[PDB]
Nucleic acid binder design. Structure first.
Ligand SMILES: [Mg+2]
Ligand SMILES: [Mg+2]
Ligand SMILES: [Mg+2]
Ligand SMILES: [Mg+2]
Ligand SMILES: [Mg+2]
Ligand SMILES: [Mg+2]
Ligand SMILES: [Mg+2]
Ligand SMILES: [Mg+2]
Ligand SMILES: [Mg+2]
Ligand SMILES: [Mg+2]
Ligand SMILES: [Mg+2]
Ligand SMILES: [Mg+2]
Ligand SMILES: [Mg+2]
Ligand SMILES: [Mg+2]
Ligand SMILES: [Mg+2]
Ligand SMILES: [Mg+2]
Ligand SMILES: [Mg+2]
Ligand SMILES: [Mg+2]
Ligand SMILES: [Mg+2]
Ligand SMILES: [Mg+2]
Ligand SMILES: [Mg+2]
Ligand SMILES: [Mg+2]
Ligand SMILES: [Mg+2]
Lengths: 48, 58, 119, 210, 102
RNA sequence: GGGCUUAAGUUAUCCGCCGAAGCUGUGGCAACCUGUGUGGUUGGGUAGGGGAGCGUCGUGUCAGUGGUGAAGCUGCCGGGU
């Protein structure tokens, strides 16, 4: 007699997706990349 | 043993890390905070190290 | 699931335009310009809620100084006399006494005069 | 717990008896497990035919709108750039499948727990059949209302020629009809009671039993 | 007849029948509290010393809990992206002065 | 800056006071530690790391609700860190 509205996930099983670049109260603006440089825009290869 | 009475009269800002750690070891945490320590040479040494930041009594 | 921004977006704009409802020029009409002034308004209000203590203490001290100098006693000697006499009536109640009950303030002045070190 | 219990076959009034095997119809109801299985079920049910055109797929926009310098305008590379009205969508939806590869043991157990919860709550009835001879919806509406309430599940399993019961209960709109080889956790949880046909219960037990 | 009294590190000039905005106290509404007096003035008669102020009792009763104005803090610093929103209400307690008995 | 040597200048010394978001008093909030009756410590903050949430749209389920007026828009009176 659970009924579909009593089904909930275990606590901690569904971590909230972090949404980046959505205001300075979170990972806003630079989006966790800092300022300028290669890493500001793409990446650096692991073999480099 | 005369139970030294030490109170902080100046802030630890801009003091040397030596002095700040000496204050922490003495247990003083704010300006006006008072601690009681034994008349032991180590505590006399801490007091003379931070003598410009604290006052001592008996 | 395409989402249109307007219904959610207007809420902060209405809040800020309400908060800026006495400002001059663009500061009360335009959300972006009102937003800049609300930052300054909040900073000024926070700073002034803490400077208000000092402002009112200064006003009380000036009024006490005037009232005690009317009795031939400076503010510093008056306060030292009260401290020595052990009367812990504060700058605020003392100023209210000076404005309202000048006779009670003068009695306190006599108390301070008697409690002076006389040295 | 693995207790096998006994329910009584009805056919309206009374008939023989049927056994609930216990190893299924009496197990734990792992709510998180059931939730995951049901969510995966609905995700598989999703169709996901949604798409947008990127700046490369929007018509036109091949040439630079104007010179890079000298015009006093911002540097633009295409009229279909995402910041333009009528330009491409940057990270809009693309067609995809939402099916999740839930393990067999997880899916089956969730089904066992969902069945077991209302087996312990006494919401499974077993009937020899509904309707006799030719097939109406009035008859079974009665058989089920005599059973209890109207948020129902029916099992008739007989996938090829149980047209009588299937077509009788097909049009109730508060009855969900299934073959025993398609019980699935979503429907079991959604059901407030299950009524098995005798053959339906027998075939489900035969398909899965220890 | 009035009294300079103290309550919760803040002083008031109270008189019998006055309503005073006191810092929140645990005593329940309708009960009575004693406000410590620091001065008494009965008209050209000023009681100020501790020994006599010990004998005088300012008695008052609790009326209810009232909230202050809603304060909106927005800490902000330019060119850093820093903001911090906060609010405050600062509940107090009504008091009615019932008597200053010497 | 006004003005100041009739110091409101320099200097020695004594007695007071002013003075910060420092300290203390009072009221509220929060993080952490600790034996878990207490209490202790802490809470400026950019890049950045961690944690917990608000609001919008779609949707399963249950409970609903709506021309005796939904959505949206717009006043007033309130509420929350
Ligand atoms: Mg930032
Ligand atoms: Mg920005
Ligand atoms: Mg980073
Ligand atoms: Mg950058
Ligand atoms: Mg940049
Ligand atoms: Mg750089
Ligand atoms: Mg970098
Ligand atoms: Mg790296
Ligand atoms: Mg590569
Ligand atoms: Mg002056
Ligand atoms: Mg192209
Ligand atoms: Mg231009
Ligand atoms: Mg190009
Ligand atoms: Mg298009
Ligand atoms: Mg800077
Ligand atoms: Mg202060
Ligand atoms: Mg402080
Ligand atoms: Mg304090
Ligand atoms: Mg912080
Ligand atoms: Mg701090
Ligand atoms: Mg940061
Ligand atoms: Mg209706
Ligand atoms: Mg809508």
């Amino acid at each position: 007699a659970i009924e579909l509205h009593d089904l909930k996930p275990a606590p901690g099983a569904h971590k909230a997706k972090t949404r980046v670049g959505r205001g300075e109260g979170s990972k806003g603006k630079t989006a966790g990349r800092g300022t300028k440089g290669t890493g500001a825009r793409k990446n650096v290869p692991e073999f480099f | 043993m005369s139970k030294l009475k030490i109170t902080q009269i100046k802030s630890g800002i801009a003091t040397k890390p030596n002095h700040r750690e000496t204050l922490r070891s003495l247990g003083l945490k704010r300006i006006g905070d008072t601690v009681i320590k034994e008349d032991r040479p180590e505590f006399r040494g801490m007091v003379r190290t931070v003598r410009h930041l604290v006052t001592m009594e008996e | 699931a395409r989402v249109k921004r307007s219904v959610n977006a207007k809420k902060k704009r209405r809040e800020v335009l309400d908060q800026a409802s006495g400002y001059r020029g663009q500061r009360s009409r335009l959300y972006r310009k009102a937003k800049e002034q609300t930052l300054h308004s909040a900073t000024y209000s926070f700073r002034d809620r803490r400077a208000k203590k000092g402002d009112f203490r200064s006003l009380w001290i000036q009024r006490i100084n005037a009232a005690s100098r009317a009795q031939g006693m400076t503010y510093n000697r008056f306060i030292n006399g009260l401290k020595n006499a052990g009367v812990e009536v504060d700058r605020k109640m003392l100023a209210e006494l000076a404005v309202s009950d000048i006779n009670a303030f003068n009695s306190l002045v006599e108390v301070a005069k008697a409690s002076q070190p006389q040295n | 717990e693995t207790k096998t219990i006994d329910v009584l076959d009805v056919k309206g009034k009374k008939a023989g008896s049927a056994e609930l095997p216990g190893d299924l119809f009496d197990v734990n109801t792992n709510i998180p497990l059931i939730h995951q299985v049901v969510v995966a079920q609905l995700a598989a049910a999703r169709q996901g035919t949604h798409a947008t055109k990127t700046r490369g797929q929007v018509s036109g926009g091949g040439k630079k709108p104007w010179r890079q310098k000298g015009t006093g305008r911002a540097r633009q590379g295409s009229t279909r750039a995402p910041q333009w009205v009528g330009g491409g969508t940057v990270h809009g939806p693309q067609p995809r499948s939402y099916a999740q590869r839930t393990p067999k043991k997880m899916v089956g157990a969730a089904l066992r727990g969902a069945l077991s919860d209302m087996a312990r709550d006494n919401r499974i009835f077993v009937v020899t059949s509904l309707v006799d001879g030719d097939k109406p919806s009035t008859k079974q509406a009665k058989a089920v209302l005599s059973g209890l309430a109207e948020l129902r599940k029916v099992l008739v399993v007989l996938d090829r020629s149980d047209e009588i019961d299937w077509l009788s209960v097909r049009n109730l709109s508060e009855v969900h009809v299934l073959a025993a080889d398609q019980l699935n956790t979503y429907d079991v949880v959604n059901a407030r009671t299950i009524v098995f046909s005798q053959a339906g219960l027998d075939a489900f037990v035969g398909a899965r039993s220890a | 007849m009035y009294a300079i009294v103290r309550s919760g590190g803040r002083q008031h000039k109270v008189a019998v029948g006055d309503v005073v905005e006191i810092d929140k106290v645990a005593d329940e509404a309708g009960s009575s509290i004693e406000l410590t007096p620091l001065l008494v003035v009965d008209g050209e008669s000023v009681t100020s010393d501790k020994d006599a102020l010990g004998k005088v009792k300012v008695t008052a009763e609790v009326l209810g809990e009232t909230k202050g104005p809603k304060i909106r803090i927005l800490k902000y610093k330019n060119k850093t992206g820093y903001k911090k929103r906060q609010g405050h209400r600062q509940k107090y307690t009504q008091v009615k002065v019932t008597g200053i008995e010497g």
